[PDB]
């Protein structure tokens, strides 16, 4: 067709979406005022024309994963991992990113498995914890600590599974990527509704918790598939806001409408903290470009 | 443009691809004659015009995952899981699929984590083994056995991590989805090169192994992203074979060419079992439609 490539959403139902901040499926849509909180995730960040931001990368299984080599042993239950990029290349701290792509963007004791394969194909794997709140969590400097309950200088991967416990768990608190005394850099910006009566719309997952009491909520601004889609398409954004409507393809009915902002987040006309139920066959549909002053029908 | 949607590949480097048969990144390209083996994976199967086959579904984190409820305990280290679909809907055994979508398609002791969340948000998770070779591995009948080292009638998920050990491990041996005495049904067909001098080209990952000696090779016919891409695009296939060339975008050089078949697999002109090294910035490029008798340049 003529002119600029048209903007599109992938056609995916809620059961066909992945969380972009933790490697699990989306469970539900959620809206909240998030009173008192700065919402600034670094994974799951992209503009509508496909510019990845923060620590966002494309591979779902690399989300919250770490890769590298163990150079030493701390505390015999702790190991020093010299981080590389999730794709194998060494990590250059001078790169204009907050941390290696896919690095966890929240404070937690992350339950996972540390595994190695030696050149002679002898292997080991042990479950353990990655403490992203720890003073020794310094991925931007090129190292983190892995805990276990391992061979030195062998190819190593940490596969995240969930939360070990609820201690230190704050999904909206960023890690100190270079350690506690150092500023984070090259961050994706914080996000907020800019129009009165509006709240953020999240794609929510409830991640596994080894022990304790929590809904384990991880909220992402965009599902991983949307990010992958925008990256491929790279469709220009004529205005700052795309108008999207959640549509039931069978009936043709529109359940609600939302603002998809150019910087990569969604707002809806709603109030309070609540899950938003959608039909299993329904999906978001891009209808037209509008501006920041468009007035959404209340949900 | 005019006429039928044009066929395209997503532009993704090898470091930007996911395995469609196990939830891990692609490590390398691999080719092999696979002498003596029937190559019939059920995950990672799609036609070029986006028809998913076998047990293939879209969500990467649902690959080799299971979901359901535990109604009883066998052997107190064994639990009976009544499987649902990975998206939470109940599984109907009369559906025209070999098993619930995302069910593992190979024989192994799969190391993973079983987790639950109760309505009061009290949670537990324990690592364990899913034995896909077991007589009690009957997902098509609606049940499997989960091993641990758990609450009854609570929402349960098995998150795969890797191989517990190398026993029974055969990546090309399909499970008996309804148990040992029953035929598998609705299978994606076996695949083979149909032109002399040609071999299958695989997207290979080396998955974690808790203990033992193995390269842990899992070979998929198409990366998960290609499957997701074809599903969205649904571009018609004018002929049975698409001609693709691995191209270095910087230089413009073509390293090698391959046949991308309509049924969703790749062949190359090569011999023997060997890894195929590609430049980090390179990617497959669709150049034109050809037929089954096209003669590929030797690699």
Numbering used by the authors:
A (entry chain B), B (entry chain A): 221 to 294, 297 to 371, 376 to 525
Provide passages from the article that reported this PDB entry.
The norovirus genome contains three open reading frames (ORF1 to 3), where ORF1 encodes the nonstructural proteins, ORF2 encodes the capsid protein (VP1), and ORF3 encodes a minor structural protein (VP2). The S domain forms a scaffold surrounding the viral RNA, whereas the P domain contains the determinants of strain diversity and recognition of attachment factors. There is considerable antigenic drift among human noroviruses, and new genetic variants evolve every other year, which can result in new epidemics worldwide. It is well known that human noroviruses bind with various specificities to histo-blood group antigens (HBGAs), which are present in saliva, on the surface of epithelial cells, and in mucosal secretions. To elucidate the constraints on non-HBGA binders from a structural perspective, we determined the X-ray crystal structures of the capsid-protruding domains (P domains) of two GII.1 (HV and noro485) nonbinders and one GII.2 (SMV) HBGA nonbinder.
